[PDB]
Amino acid sequence: DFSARTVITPDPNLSIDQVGVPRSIAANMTFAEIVTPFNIDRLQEL
């Protein structure tokens, strides 16, 4: 799921591993997840 390219800005607060992403880009991107009883409600609400 290739995303739309966007400029890069620094953020000292974020950890080096962490990366900041806008809401709009994340909205388009999707992550398929297998539902399980332990998280059935989590997928039900989303």
């Binding site: 607060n13 974020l14 806008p22 809401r23 709009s24």
Partner: protein
Amino acid sequence: MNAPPAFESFLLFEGEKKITINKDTKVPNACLFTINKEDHTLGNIIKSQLLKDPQVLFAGYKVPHPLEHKIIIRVQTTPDYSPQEAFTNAITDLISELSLLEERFRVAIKDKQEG
């Protein structure tokens, strides 16, 4: 589009507690006050006053991220004292501190106006 609303800095989000007290298990007699929808204008107000209290061993505040608009305050006191009391008592001093300043300002403002 992606620009956050300007009023979210101070506006309280629906169904979100403004203040949350969390105890710290690293050291006894320590608590974290994760205030939401506030900036450094409020963090430094209480930190300085908390230091003035002799019964406070460690008091400070920090912001995890400026865009988050939430401030975290950590207060540690002596076993007899409690961090919760320190946060409450410090606020009362600030209200009294500003009341004298506000009252005294109104006393001196008229003095300059008349001469």
